[PDB]
Design an enzyme around this catalytic site. Structure first.
Site, PDB file in Angstrom:
ATOM      1  N   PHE A 231       0.788  -1.242   0.000  1.00 51.67           N
ATOM      2  CA  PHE A 231       0.000   0.000   0.000  1.00 51.67           C
ATOM      3  C   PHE A 231       0.831   1.310   0.000  1.00 51.67           C
ATOM      4  O   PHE A 231       0.432   2.292   0.640  1.00 51.67           O
ATOM      5  CB  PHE A 231      -1.033   0.006   1.147  1.00 51.67           C
ATOM      6  CG  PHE A 231      -1.992  -1.158   1.057  1.00 51.67           C
ATOM      7  CD1 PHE A 231      -1.850  -2.263   1.884  1.00 51.67           C
ATOM      8  CD2 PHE A 231      -3.014  -1.165   0.122  1.00 51.67           C
ATOM      9  CE1 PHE A 231      -2.730  -3.345   1.786  1.00 51.67           C
ATOM     10  CE2 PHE A 231      -3.890  -2.245   0.027  1.00 51.67           C
ATOM     11  CZ  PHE A 231      -3.738  -3.330   0.855  1.00 51.67           C
TER      12      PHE A 231
ATOM     13  N   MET B 187      14.903  -0.904   8.202  1.00 45.25           N
ATOM     14  CA  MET B 187      15.219  -2.336   8.271  1.00 45.25           C
ATOM     15  C   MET B 187      16.014  -2.645   7.005  1.00 45.25           C
ATOM     16  O   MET B 187      15.441  -2.905   5.960  1.00 45.25           O
ATOM     17  CB  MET B 187      13.906  -3.137   8.351  1.00 45.25           C
ATOM     18  CG  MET B 187      13.039  -2.762   9.589  1.00 45.25           C
ATOM     19  SD  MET B 187      13.786  -3.213  11.163  1.00 45.25           S
ATOM     20  CE  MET B 187      13.621  -5.022  11.086  1.00 45.25           C
TER      21      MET B 187
ATOM     22  N   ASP C 180      -2.732 -10.409  10.056  1.00 42.92           N
ATOM     23  CA  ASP C 180      -2.174 -10.808   8.752  1.00 42.92           C
ATOM     24  C   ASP C 180      -0.696 -11.204   8.909  1.00 42.92           C
ATOM     25  O   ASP C 180       0.150 -10.813   8.110  1.00 42.92           O
ATOM     26  CB  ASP C 180      -2.360  -9.673   7.713  1.00 42.92           C
ATOM     27  CG  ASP C 180      -2.075 -10.069   6.263  1.00 42.92           C
ATOM     28  OD1 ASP C 180      -1.956 -11.291   5.984  1.00 42.92           O
ATOM     29  OD2 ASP C 180      -1.867  -9.161   5.438  1.00 42.92           O
TER      30      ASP C 180
ATOM     31  N   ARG D 126       5.929 -12.130   4.440  1.00 43.42           N
ATOM     32  CA  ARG D 126       5.899 -10.913   3.594  1.00 43.42           C
ATOM     33  C   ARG D 126       5.786  -9.598   4.431  1.00 43.42           C
ATOM     34  O   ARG D 126       6.201  -8.541   3.958  1.00 43.42           O
ATOM     35  CB  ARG D 126       4.753 -10.987   2.565  1.00 43.42           C
ATOM     36  CG  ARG D 126       3.351 -10.959   3.182  1.00 43.42           C
ATOM     37  CD  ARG D 126       2.236 -11.043   2.140  1.00 43.42           C
ATOM     38  NE  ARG D 126       0.945 -11.298   2.784  1.00 43.42           N
ATOM     39  CZ  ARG D 126       0.516 -12.490   3.208  1.00 43.42           C
ATOM     40  NH1 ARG D 126       1.260 -13.572   3.038  1.00 43.42           N
ATOM     41  NH2 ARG D 126      -0.655 -12.604   3.809  1.00 43.42           N
ATOM     42  N   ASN D 127       5.222  -9.690   5.652  1.00 37.52           N
ATOM     43  CA  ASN D 127       5.023  -8.584   6.602  1.00 37.52           C
ATOM     44  C   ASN D 127       6.125  -8.422   7.632  1.00 37.52           C
ATOM     45  O   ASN D 127       6.112  -7.414   8.336  1.00 37.52           O
ATOM     46  CB  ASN D 127       3.661  -8.756   7.338  1.00 37.52           C
ATOM     47  CG  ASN D 127       2.510  -8.391   6.443  1.00 37.52           C
ATOM     48  OD1 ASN D 127       2.623  -7.525   5.569  1.00 37.52           O
ATOM     49  ND2 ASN D 127       1.377  -9.019   6.628  1.00 37.52           N
TER      50      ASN D 127
ATOM     51  N   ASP E 280       3.178  -4.129  10.191  1.00 32.32           N
ATOM     52  CA  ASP E 280       1.807  -4.100   9.641  1.00 32.32           C
ATOM     53  C   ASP E 280       0.749  -4.753  10.520  1.00 32.32           C
ATOM     54  O   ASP E 280      -0.339  -5.063  10.039  1.00 32.32           O
ATOM     55  CB  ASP E 280       1.764  -4.698   8.220  1.00 32.32           C
ATOM     56  CG  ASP E 280       2.521  -3.880   7.184  1.00 32.32           C
ATOM     57  OD1 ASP E 280       2.718  -2.669   7.411  1.00 32.32           O
ATOM     58  OD2 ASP E 280       2.842  -4.432   6.112  1.00 32.32           O
TER      59      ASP E 280
HETATM   60  C1  LIG Z   1       8.375   3.056   6.299  1.00 34.48           C
HETATM   61  O1  LIG Z   1       8.584   1.687   5.929  1.00 34.48           O
HETATM   62  C2  LIG Z   1       7.668   0.761   6.350  1.00 34.48           C
HETATM   63  C3  LIG Z   1       6.586   1.074   7.149  1.00 34.48           C
HETATM   64  C4  LIG Z   1       5.708   0.077   7.561  1.00 34.48           C
HETATM   65  C5  LIG Z   1       4.572   0.544   8.406  1.00 34.48           C
HETATM   66  O2  LIG Z   1       4.132   1.682   8.271  1.00 34.48           O
HETATM   67  N1  LIG Z   1       4.104  -0.336   9.326  1.00 34.48           N
HETATM   68  C6  LIG Z   1       3.089  -0.132  10.273  1.00 34.48           C
HETATM   69  C7  LIG Z   1       2.413   1.088  10.400  1.00 34.48           C
HETATM   70  C8  LIG Z   1       1.428   1.209  11.371  1.00 34.48           C
HETATM   71  C9  LIG Z   1       0.667   2.497  11.519  1.00 34.48           C
HETATM   72  F1  LIG Z   1       1.177   3.297  12.450  1.00 34.48           F
HETATM   73  F2  LIG Z   1       0.643   3.223  10.403  1.00 34.48           F
HETATM   74  F3  LIG Z   1      -0.613   2.327  11.829  1.00 34.48           F
HETATM   75  C10 LIG Z   1       1.168   0.118  12.188  1.00 34.48           C
HETATM   76  C11 LIG Z   1       1.883  -1.048  12.001  1.00 34.48           C
HETATM   77  N2  LIG Z   1       2.838  -1.190  11.069  1.00 34.48           N
HETATM   78  C12 LIG Z   1       5.915  -1.232   7.140  1.00 34.48           C
HETATM   79  C13 LIG Z   1       6.995  -1.552   6.341  1.00 34.48           C
HETATM   80  C14 LIG Z   1       7.895  -0.565   5.936  1.00 34.48           C
HETATM   81  C15 LIG Z   1       9.039  -0.955   5.098  1.00 34.48           C
HETATM   82  N3  LIG Z   1       8.806  -1.456   3.837  1.00 34.48           N
HETATM   83  C16 LIG Z   1      10.023  -1.702   3.317  1.00 34.48           C
HETATM   84  C17 LIG Z   1      10.280  -2.285   1.967  1.00 34.48           C
HETATM   85  C18 LIG Z   1       9.227  -1.852   0.940  1.00 34.48           C
HETATM   86  C19 LIG Z   1       9.479  -2.516  -0.413  1.00 34.48           C
HETATM   87  C20 LIG Z   1       9.441  -4.029  -0.248  1.00 34.48           C
HETATM   88  C21 LIG Z   1       9.845  -4.889  -1.454  1.00 34.48           C
HETATM   89  C22 LIG Z   1      11.163  -5.566  -1.073  1.00 34.48           C
HETATM   90  C23 LIG Z   1      11.385  -5.245   0.380  1.00 34.48           C
HETATM   91  O3  LIG Z   1      12.274  -5.676   1.090  1.00 34.48           O
HETATM   92  N4  LIG Z   1      10.388  -4.443   0.796  1.00 34.48           N
HETATM   93  C24 LIG Z   1      10.266  -3.812   2.109  1.00 34.48           C
HETATM   94  N5  LIG Z   1      11.012  -1.402   4.207  1.00 34.48           N
HETATM   95  C25 LIG Z   1      12.377  -1.475   4.132  1.00 34.48           C
HETATM   96  C26 LIG Z   1      13.099  -1.027   5.220  1.00 34.48           C
HETATM   97  N6  LIG Z   1      12.544  -0.541   6.343  1.00 34.48           N
HETATM   98  C27 LIG Z   1      11.218  -0.489   6.445  1.00 34.48           C
HETATM   99  N7  LIG Z   1      10.694  -0.049   7.600  1.00 34.48           N
HETATM  100  C28 LIG Z   1      10.394  -0.917   5.361  1.00 34.48           C
END
Ligand SMILES: COc1cc(C(=O)Nc2cc(C(F)(F)F)ccn2)ccc1-c1nc([C@@H]2CC[C@H]3CCC(=O)N3C2)n2ccnc(N)c12
Ligand SMILES: CN(C)CCCC(=O)N1CCC[C@H]1c1nc(-c2ccc(C(=O)Nc3nccs3)cc2)c2c(N)nccn12
Length: 265
Positions: A19, A83, A127, A131-132, A145
């Site tokens: 998303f 991460m 979920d 993948r999460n 997530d």
């Molecule tokens: C800013 O980065 C991220 C934020 C959230 C997130 O907002 N999580 C969340 C948010 C909330 C709330 F506060 F919004 F509600 C509650 C619970 N969880 C989740 C994941 C990431 C996140 N997504 C990716 C890559 C995206 C491309 C794909 C493709 C390949 C790869 O490695 N991938 C991973 N990341 C890589 C490094 N670090 C991260 N923190 C991250």
């Protein structure tokens, strides 16, 4: 919990996550952060912003740390812990890591500690899957997530008949009756241990979602990955009891994982 978007410096495109696009950057030029730009029209923004504020209070070493949000502009930004090794699913699939089984068990342990913490706060993930989960520069796995499926507007992800619903990570009572509970997170955790020990294979890889849902209703299960010892397989198998009340808690699963780590390692 508002972050000033002017305190953010964008350094590298990390790809398209679930998303929205994600970038690596700095906060106040010194601190590493990941910045996710929420795809417009994909989330229930008012409900999502209300929950995001409550989730800044959830903190654990094995949960990806939420730093703040930027909502005084569109698209919304979510700032979190960076991460460096990306999503667990792609990390498991890179055969160059040549993982030892002790490393695979530690990944399960990391996730189990995060889930025991969410279970202590009566917070469902809803979920949980490889993948999460995300992996930092030190190879530590952290859960992300948690609870977000509730704000996803696209109906293909939300309902059991949907094309994007996590059928392969769902227990029989979820597939048949939409009965979500802490025990449906427990079932998904057993599937996640299977994904780790299978080095990222798709659960029920030669089945469709429809055939998987039929296999499960008949009582059939995933079988032992080659890298899982008999004791590790007993742990993941205990998550898939047909009766939800017979499945263990995350506290019990954590005690069992630590026992195997001390015995095997
Ligand atoms: C800013 O980065 C991220 C934020 C959230 C997130 O907002 N999580 C969340 C948010 C909330 C709330 F506060 F919004 F509600 C509650 C619970 N969880 C989740 C994941 C990431 C996140 N997504 C990716 C890559 C995206 C491309 C794909 C493709 C390949 C790869 O490695 N991938 C991973 N990341 C890589 C490094 N670090 C991260 N923190 C991250
Ligand atoms: C070196 N140091 C002084 C600077 C620290 C580096 C720093 O300030 N950073 C690092 C990058 C983004 C920025 C940042 N971090 C946070 C934050 C961090 C940890 C905890 C926590 O651990 N909370 C707990 N609650 C209960 C138990 S633990 C809570 C909030 C927040 C925040 N809430 N809004 C805005 C920016 N934020």
């Amino acid at each position: 919990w508002e972050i000033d978007p002017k305190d953010l410096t964008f350094l590298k495109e990390l790809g398209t996550g679930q998303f929205g696009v994600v970038k690596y950057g700095k906060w106040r030029g010194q601190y590493d952060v990941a910045i996710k730009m929420i795809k417009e029209g994909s989330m229930s923004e008012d409900e999502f912003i209300e929950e995001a504020k409550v989730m800044m209070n959830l903190s654990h070493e094995k949960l990806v740390q939420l730093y703040g949000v930027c909502t005084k502009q569109r698209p919304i930004f979510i700032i979190t812990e960076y991460m460096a090794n990306g999503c667990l699913l792609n990390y498991l699939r890179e055969m160059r890591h040549r993982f030892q089984t002790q490393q695979l068990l530690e990944m399960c342990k990391d996730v189990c500690e995060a889930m025991e913490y969410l279970e202590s706060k009566q917070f469902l993930h809803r979920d949980l899957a490889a993948r999460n989960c995300l992996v930092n520069d030190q190879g530590v796995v952290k859960v992300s997530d948690f609870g977000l499926s509730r704000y996803v507007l696209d109906d293909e992800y939300t309902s059991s008949v949907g094309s994007k619903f996590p059928v392969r990570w769902s227990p029989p009572e979820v597939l048949m009756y939409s009965k979500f509970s802490s025990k449906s997170d427990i079932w998904a955790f057993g599937v996640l241990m299977w994904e780790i020990y299978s080095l990222g294979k798709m659960p029920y890889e030669r089945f469709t979602n429809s055939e998987t849902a039929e296999h499960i209703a008949q009582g059939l299960r995933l079988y032992r990955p080659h890298l899982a010892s008999e004791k590790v397989y007993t742990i993941m198998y205990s998550c898939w009891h047909e009766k939800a009340d017979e499945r263990p808690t995350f506290k019990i699963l954590l005690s069992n994982i630590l026992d195997v780590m001390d015995e095997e390692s």
